[PDB]
Ligand binder design. Sequence first.
Ligand SMILES: Cc1cc(C)nc(SCC(=O)Nc2ncc(Cc3cccc(OCc4cnnn4[C@H]4O[C@H](COP(=O)(O)OP(=O)(O)OC[C@H]5O[C@@H](n6cnc7c(N)ncnc76)[C@H](O)[C@@H]5O)[C@@H](O)[C@H]4O)c3)s2)n1
Ligand SMILES: [Zn+2]
Length: 300
Amino acid sequence: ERLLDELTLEGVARYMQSERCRRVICLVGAGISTSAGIPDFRSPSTGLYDNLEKYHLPYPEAIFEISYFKKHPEPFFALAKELYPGQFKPTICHYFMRLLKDKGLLLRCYTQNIDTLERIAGLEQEDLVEAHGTFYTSHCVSASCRHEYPLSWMKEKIFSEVTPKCEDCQSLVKPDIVFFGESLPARFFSCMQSDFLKVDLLLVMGTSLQVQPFASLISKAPLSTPRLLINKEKAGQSDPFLGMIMGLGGGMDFDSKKAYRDVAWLGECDQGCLALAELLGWKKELEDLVRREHASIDAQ
Ligand SMILES: Cc1cc(C)nc(SCC(=O)Nc2ncc(Cc3cccc(OCc4cnnn4[C@H]4O[C@H](COP(=O)(O)OP(=O)(O)OC[C@H]5O[C@@H](n6cnc7c(N)ncnc76)[C@H](O)[C@@H]5O)[C@@H](O)[C@H]4O)c3)s2)n1
Ligand SMILES: [Zn+2]
């Protein structure tokens, strides 16, 4: 009944190399972009949540909240200037997901990341669910207008510290990211219902699984589907405690005596992906891909 012969990266690589493993879903968060120079949200001291006091918020989550944004957008746009990536070079982890695409194993990448690195690494719109939107485009917030603006326009407003107003109607222009309180893209639900029927392997990388409904995705997979977490620390566990994110019952079981399908490889995402690629015979392909794409970016 158990699909992994052993609860290890080697077990997952052998499963991946079997014919049952045809459809892989990746679930990724900010941890897969930290080696690209983009700090994450919840790491102590460097993460965003430990760097909010200077914005003088009524509480730290306000800067994520759509109703607060609509009333006082200036903190969000000051933060956006502070965190604007100085360069957009995707990581080994991103290019591993690109290799999964090129080899026909990637059914979908569900990303929480707003930095657009998945696109730059070559995942196309069909391969991707940007579950929490991206900074790539922005829209006027007036339902009667909804004029679109490209990242170059938004970037100029952010760096000039001018609050972005729509050129046609002078309402606020918001990046197409999903704030706390907003609905997720409809693509998220349509793809979820189709993808999680088919998935043979769930790859979870670089996320604390602290945000719903995205974190519910790990429970949408069939109960035999193996789940591999590559992350600096365990996350999404089912162990109940007050303030757990997971609905009760759902969650990962790495360590109980009933554990049967969940693997935690604890370390840096780039190293874990390099180790998995090596076990699969993809290490040189992945290394060459990173080198070539990185040089291509370095030229301009
Ligand atoms: C083009 C462009 C222009 C700009 C201006 N900016 C960017 S980009 C830079 C950025 O920020 N700009 C920002 N501007 C404004 C911001 C504020 C904001 C407001 C509203 C919504 C926002 O966004 C959507 C959203 C809504 N609600 N939440 N969100 C986001 O927040 C969640 C984060 O949750 P996540 O799980 O992703 O991250 P974590 O909690 O930090 O956990 C990481 C885990 O990885 C582990 N780990 C770490 N490093 C590792 C490594 N190397 N190897 C292995 N493991 C590693 C670590 O130990 C831990 O376990 C997520 O849902 C996301 O959508 C944002 S922010 N691009
Ligand atoms: Zn407008």
